Design a protein around this ligand. Sequence first.
Ligand code: HEC
Ligand code: HEC
Lengths: 126, 126
Amino acid sequence: QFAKPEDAVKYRQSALTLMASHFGRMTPVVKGQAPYDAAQIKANVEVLKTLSALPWAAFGPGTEGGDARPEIWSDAASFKQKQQAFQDNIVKLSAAADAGDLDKLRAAFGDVGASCKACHDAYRKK
Amino acid sequence: QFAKPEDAVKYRQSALTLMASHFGRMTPVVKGQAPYDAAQIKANVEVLKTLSALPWAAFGPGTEGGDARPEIWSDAASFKQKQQAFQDNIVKLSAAADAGDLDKLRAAFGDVGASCKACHDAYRKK
Ligand code: HEC
Ligand code: HEC
């Protein structure tokens, strides 16, 4: 859906920005600094699930640019493992949110955050 | 979820960018320049439905900035009518996509596009 590489870059950066907001806005809830409303969190994690599937299709071959490292494309299998693993961490978060289980939510939230960082360490420029 | 107005601005601009891509990428399909795969379009419109609900919460009071016109906030009811009308145009598009009905898809796609423009004409700076 991208006329030029720059359009793929803009798309993925926007998708990742929205992910970061839908993830990060739960930090006060996880920490107990804001109240836990199970329905609110269930709905928010549903949005995050949808968003978390979006960036990867905008790293199609030849879409070097932005702060993407070239290693994304020199080993397509390893990058795919990282995004699939990330999305399965999001599945655990969804399951916790759907269950209304704050303890499971906290644990899953930490694992999701670790998975964001694991990808950045390998694939995002400083 | 926004520490400063700038964070709301960045969020809504990213959400609108993603909407524009999920909407605009169907133009060749509507025009018959690309093939119509009912399942592909159903899935894409589901994504668009989710995204189309997101920008509005990031025009909270005091989040003037970007290319948002101040009229968004001086008549909250009228802005809300426009975004709700837009989302109901998206509902028609969803219904068409879910039905696998290309004629209804075309018609709904045109009405959605008109609704984007109607809001821009009133509420987006040149
Ligand atoms: C690889 C499988 C990634 C996972 C998982 C996550 N992110 Fe990431 N992110 C990745 C790359 C390669 C890039 C650079 C994209 C580019 O072309 O520039 C990024 C970037 C971001 C950004 C900045 C977006 C922007 O506005 O330019 C943010 C805010 C971001 N990423 C956040 C984020 C969070 C919170 C994640 C887990 C919930 C996450 N990313 C996962 C690669 C990957
Ligand atoms: C009002 C109810 C709107 C509807 C419906 C749509 N858009 Fe719009 N859009 C609106 C505003 C007020 C703004 C400015 C936001 C800001 O603070 O700068 C915009 C902006 C866009 C953009 C630019 C985003 C960016 O990268 O800065 C795009 C690409 C865009 N809008 C597209 C778009 C499409 C395709 C719509 C219908 C499917 C649509 N918008 C609806 C207000 C409203």
